[PDB]
Amino acid sequence: LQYKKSKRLQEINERITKIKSQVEPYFEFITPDRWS
Amino acid sequence: KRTNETLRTLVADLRELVYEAEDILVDCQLQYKKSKRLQEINERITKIKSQVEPYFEFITPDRWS
Amino acid sequence: VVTVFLEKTLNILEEKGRTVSDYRKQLEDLQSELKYMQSFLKDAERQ
């Protein structure tokens, strides 16, 4: 079946998108040698 | 000039999207099949934008003689 | 008294039918995401 692999794809896609969404506002908040 | 790799991959992907978008657009001139083709291609464009955008949110960025 | 249970069984079969068709869709999704994620990781080492 494609069922088990489709739900594996679902879980890993949703974890990627969730991590992006909750990381992004922290970057929205702040903005930012060797010699001899 | 002076472009990173994510921009290069996004440009190379948007060119393929431009070609297939103006490919299916010419079939304007049932409405059901063409409306679902419009749906699929609109949703793919929007999805690609949405999942590319946070990578640009994350990072910020001669010849002589 | 009877048909609510088997109509929810109809709904769970219809959701099983929903969660098969977009297998190609999520495959393309994950491959595009792997592409952009590896381009970002190769970018972020440079800074």
Count the helix, strand and coil residues of chain B and give each as a percent rounded to the nearest 5.
75, 0, 25
Based on its alpha-carbon atoms, the radius of gyration of chain A, rounded to whole angstroms, reads: 19
End-to-end CA gap in chain C: 66
Planar angle of CA C40, B42, A16, nearest 5 degrees: 35
Touching subunits of A (3+ CB pairs, under 8 Å) are B, C
A34 carries a ligand binding annotation: yes
Cβ pair B41, A7 in contact under 8 A: no
Write down the H helix ranges in chain C.
3-21, 23-44
Question: How were these coordinates obtained?
Answer: cryo-EM
* Cα–Cα distance measured from residue B18 to residue B21, given in angstroms and rounded to the nearest whole number: 5
Residues of chain C with C-beta less than 8 angstroms from the C-beta of A32: none
> Which one-letter DSSP state was computed for residue A14?
H
**Residue owning tokens 């609510």:** C4
